[PDB]
Amino acid sequence: LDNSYKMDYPEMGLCIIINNKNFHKSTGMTSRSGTDVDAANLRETFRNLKYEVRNKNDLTREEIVELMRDVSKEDHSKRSSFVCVLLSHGEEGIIFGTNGPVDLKKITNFFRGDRCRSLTGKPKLFIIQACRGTELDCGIEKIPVDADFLYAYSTAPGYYSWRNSKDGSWFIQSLCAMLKQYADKLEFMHILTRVNRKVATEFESFSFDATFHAKKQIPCIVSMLTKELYFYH
């Protein structure tokens, strides 16, 4: 029953956390308050899952690329999987470096099944906490080279992604919580489904500005995985 990915390679794999807080005067982008909490939460959570975590802060659109280029050239033969978290401002299909915009595709292609042979056939996980637009939700009372990729977006396509200055982002907050609670039992899709309900039901925005008040959010799981994924054997 080759129904689920093999996770008992010597190493689980590395976890690359890119944590962008401060942005150049050129961008006229704000400071992403709360993120440092998320980065910490991710680091602890992912170490407990046994990933080789590496925290990189405030990287430039160029540095994002270069970092991604290297990791891809490494030998992930002894590694079960690859995980990468991008934390910064965004728009549909784009994450911001400290100086400018990077197209998500450009940093994921380094890892396509034909460009990173040592990751072929293993889960490439990309967790993305960033805006995919500005829409606010008001709520209501041989294999394919693109295969083995999963994108865990913090918001639906086109939408704002809410962050909290004390607790970190709703999404990364809930994800950590949920992994911490279920990584040893459930399959990853099912954990991410739990994440969804958590964000969807337990969180609501607060502002003095009625435009930005009582706003809701749903995360968006995008999976072209071919197997069930368990963080234990």
Next chain:
Amino acid sequence: DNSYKMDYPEMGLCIIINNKNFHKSTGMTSRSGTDVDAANLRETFRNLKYEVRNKNDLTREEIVELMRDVSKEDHSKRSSFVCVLLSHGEEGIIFGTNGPVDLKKITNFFRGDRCRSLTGKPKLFIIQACRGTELDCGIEKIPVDADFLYAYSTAPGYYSWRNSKDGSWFIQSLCAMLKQYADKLEFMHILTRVNRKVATEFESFSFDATFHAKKQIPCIVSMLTKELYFYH
């Protein structure tokens, strides 16, 4: 509350918009063998106890208008909702016979705030249609946007392969996999089996290299907040 409540008096409707012949003023060629999917799909969702509704060769206006009506119906005694689209497409759009429609335009109809009787209930949209023209060479209070799931036949940007006799790689595989697992596995896992099946069993064939030995990976897009079992 872990999984959706699927025990209403009815499962719900399964509209299926199957477009085979297109207008002369479109350049669009006719989608041979699509009826094979439309049938295979109908039989399948019927077995899941869905109220299946077939529609052929709709224009863009017809499509918009059918969805508006169906969304205006009363879904209170229904567990979920399924809409299948079989047509030409491009990223974010599927084609009517006379021309294009933003997919968002058809789905917005069911947003929690617009189809009030479907709030809290799964909304599925299975999309067999191009999302672009790249070929894969292969290698050796709740949110109004919540409780939605899209089962696309291909990754963003990519073409989508069909077989005029046997049916599309994706729909052929969905039906096969739902037939066989709809009563063991959760939906997400069925769909993960569909990915493996389309991803490892099918390979394009052409006398021209350009179209030879091409692969395809479908793409699950989930905004559900509970697990989904076609049983209980």
